[PDB]
Scaffold this active site. Structure first.
Site, short mmCIF file in Angstrom:
data_model
loop_
_atom_site.label_atom_id
_atom_site.label_comp_id
_atom_site.label_asym_id
_atom_site.label_seq_id
_atom_site.Cartn_x
_atom_site.Cartn_y
_atom_site.Cartn_z
N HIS A 231 54.64 4.36 -8.73
CA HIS A 231 55.16 5.27 -9.74
C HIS A 231 55.04 4.70 -11.16
O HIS A 231 55.32 5.43 -12.10
CB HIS A 231 56.56 5.79 -9.42
CG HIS A 231 57.64 4.78 -9.58
ND1 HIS A 231 58.26 4.21 -8.47
CD2 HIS A 231 58.24 4.33 -10.70
CE1 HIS A 231 59.17 3.36 -8.95
NE2 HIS A 231 59.21 3.41 -10.29
N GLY B 106 64.10 0.00 -14.99
CA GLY B 106 63.26 -1.15 -15.33
C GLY B 106 63.23 -2.20 -14.22
O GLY B 106 62.39 -3.10 -14.27
N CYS C 213 62.48 -1.59 -11.04
CA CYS C 213 61.47 -1.27 -10.03
C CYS C 213 60.40 -2.32 -9.96
O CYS C 213 60.04 -2.89 -10.99
CB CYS C 213 60.89 0.12 -10.28
SG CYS C 213 62.15 1.39 -10.40
O1 LIG Z 1 65.06 5.68 -9.37
C1 LIG Z 1 64.40 5.33 -10.34
N1 LIG Z 1 64.60 4.19 -11.01
C2 LIG Z 1 65.69 3.34 -10.77
C3 LIG Z 1 65.70 2.43 -9.72
N2 LIG Z 1 66.72 1.62 -9.47
C4 LIG Z 1 67.79 1.70 -10.28
C5 LIG Z 1 67.87 2.57 -11.34
C6 LIG Z 1 66.81 3.43 -11.60
C7 LIG Z 1 66.90 4.46 -12.70
O2 LIG Z 1 68.18 4.49 -13.34
C8 LIG Z 1 63.30 6.20 -10.94
C9 LIG Z 1 63.88 7.47 -11.56
O3 LIG Z 1 63.90 8.44 -10.48
C10 LIG Z 1 62.93 8.08 -9.57
C11 LIG Z 1 62.46 8.83 -8.51
C12 LIG Z 1 61.59 8.23 -7.61
C13 LIG Z 1 61.21 6.92 -7.81
CL1 LIG Z 1 60.14 6.17 -6.66
C14 LIG Z 1 61.65 6.18 -8.88
C15 LIG Z 1 62.54 6.77 -9.77
#
Ligand SMILES: O=C(Nc1cnccc1CO)[C@@H]1COc2ccc(Cl)cc21
Ligand SMILES: O=C(Nc1cnccc1CO)[C@@H]1COc2ccc(Cl)cc21
EC number: 3.4.19.12
Lengths: 304, 304
Positions: free
Chosen positions: A41, A143, A145
């Site tokens: 993503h 951030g 990810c």
């Molecule tokens: O989830 C996310 N980020 C995130 C991850 N871990 C913690 C926080 C965040 C964002 O606050 C982003 C925002 O929505 C999507 C939907 C699908 C995917 Cl694969 C990734 C994301």
């Protein structure tokens, strides 16, 4: 003396963290040998995350669109491919800090350490369990990810998790290092059901053994139980059913302490039925399930 | 989303760990620049630990008696000196992996990460608080002496603790990096009283703010209190008295959440007086005091 929720030393993994930027999205990548792994993503905008067509989005990207940086070190991208939900960016330089490593898909109920990262920089390390419903209860913000989960067996890092998403419930979902999600999740901004979760029974029993080893013994009683009787209680309290395979892995702890596994099950049965009565076990006022029997053995013997 | 007991990434500290052997005793040392720091009791046998005369024991030792090894790397010892309860072994080679560092003496109630080591090899990392009575509730076995506690501010490691001893109660005692014990402890095998401990009030309040930020809000109520009224409750429940200095450091959390510090004190007052009623806060069934307000801000904003 003492028992803590200990993470593996993160140094070997810190040396692998890089920042990956594609367009306006920045996240973390894992640089092992001459490949950088990151969530696919990274190629999406927020507008795309509703229902991304990853194949079409990736077709618009060239090697030079993936900016990979490791502190001052800018990496030259010479190939890109998508494998399940991860992108693999081939770079022209093998990471000099690549540890001995493996990619493993862990089972639910196993534990691992997470090195939370932002913009390719490590911020902290914590230990957690992969829930029986394939989510993790981590600490991740936007951030994070691409941050990874791992275990270490002497000099070898086994990477088992890459962070992708926070569900609307505040729990976390991600993939193995081949990009396959743990659980039913998809990398799309849609509300997604995480299954019914359960408590990891074998880990609770392992932790009760760790408690006895360290002197917290008040919960030991004069009773015993059977696997069948214990499993009726486990079902009532939403615990995983205990099997002979779980009893077998508790063998070392039973042998060291002299407390038969089914006698420890009778202590766990009484704690489920009566609660802790305002008392604590290893500094916890609830039954802890984030330590496997192997974690208890490792921590109680001093393995490096 | 989520809140975990997170340790600092340990890589910078792993690069400093060495094994020190003197006679038959082996423990861990910290190699920074051209000096190796370790507990002075490396020069004792078990027979000596009853009431060691460290000055006389060290007089029997020469530079060549201190064997210092960092994996395959054998270090050549060119000087030795005792400073309080630490030995400083001058070596002929500066550690190439020496991070930017400082030695700091932390205050009771502050938190730090411990890199537990055995024979100079890191085994795990965990976060803990220096108790108000100057002990730490760690996870340490024989051979862990010389393992260090630290904090990291961007690229700088502030070393604050070196492990020396387990008290007969199973809690841990150690020194700053100048070898001064935290608390009344001495490096001798004698039963030693750790003072009356208290709960770190400002940290409990910080953690309640972390809970609200992450959605655990059930404990918020319609009440307020005063510092005076709250401190009568704190005294009854063996909590540290709250001061205006503590209220001031909670300012950012109060500002971010809009919950006035004294309103959060009223929630803490009700939790002390009524318990948790079988409910949890951030996965805990007790009031957690191992997160400082700075830790909560760092974790909730994503600092690297
Ligand atoms: O989830 C996310 N980020 C995130 C991850 N871990 C913690 C926080 C965040 C964002 O606050 C982003 C925002 O929505 C999507 C939907 C699908 C995917 Cl694969 C990734 C994301
Ligand atoms: O406490 C000790 N080690 C230890 C530390 N941490 C954890 C475990 C252990 C030993 O099981 C040793 C044995 O007794 C003394 C008395 C004074 C000092 Cl300074 C050191 C020691």
């Amino acid at each position: 003396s003492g028992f803590r929720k200990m993470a593996f030393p993160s140094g070997k993994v810190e040396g692998c963290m890089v920042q990956v930027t594609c367009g306006t999205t920045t996240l973390n990548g894992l640089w092992l040998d001459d490949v950088v792994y990151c969530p696919r993503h990274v190629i999406c905008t927020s507008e795309d995350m509703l229902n991304p067509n990853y194949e079409d989005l990736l077709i618009r990207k060239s090697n030079h669109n993936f900016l990979v940086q490791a502190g001052n070190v800018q990496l030259r991208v010479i190939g890109h491919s998508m494998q399940n939900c991860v992108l693999k960016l081939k770079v022209d330089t093998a990471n000099p800090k690549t540890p001995k490593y493996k990619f493993v898909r862990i089972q639910p109920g196993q534990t691992f350490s997470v090195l939370a990262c932002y913009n390719g920089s490590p911020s902290g390390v914590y230990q957690c369990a992969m829930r029986p419903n394939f989510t993790i209860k981590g600490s991740f913000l936007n951030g994070s990810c691409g941050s990874v989960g791992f275990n270490i067996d002497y000099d070898c890092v086994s990477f088992c998790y890459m962070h992708h998403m926070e569900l609307p419930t505040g729990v976390h979902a991600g993939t193995d290092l081949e990009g396959n999600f743990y659980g039913p999740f998809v990398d799309r901004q849609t509300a997604q059901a995480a299954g019914t979760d359960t408590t990891i029974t074998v880990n609770v029993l392992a932790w009760l053994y760790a408690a006895v080893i360290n002197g917290d013994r008040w919960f030991l009683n004069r009773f015993t139980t059977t696997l069948n009787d214990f499993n009726l209680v486990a079902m009532k309290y939403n615990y995983e059913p205990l099997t002979q395979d779980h009893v077998d892995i508790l063998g070392p702890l039973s042998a060291q302490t002299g407390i038969a596994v089914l006698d420890m099950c009778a202590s766990l049965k009484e704690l489920l039925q009566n609660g802790m009565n305002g008392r604590t076990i290893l500094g916890s006022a609830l039954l802890e399930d984030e330590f496997t029997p192997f974690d208890v053995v490792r921590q109680c013997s001093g393995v490096t």
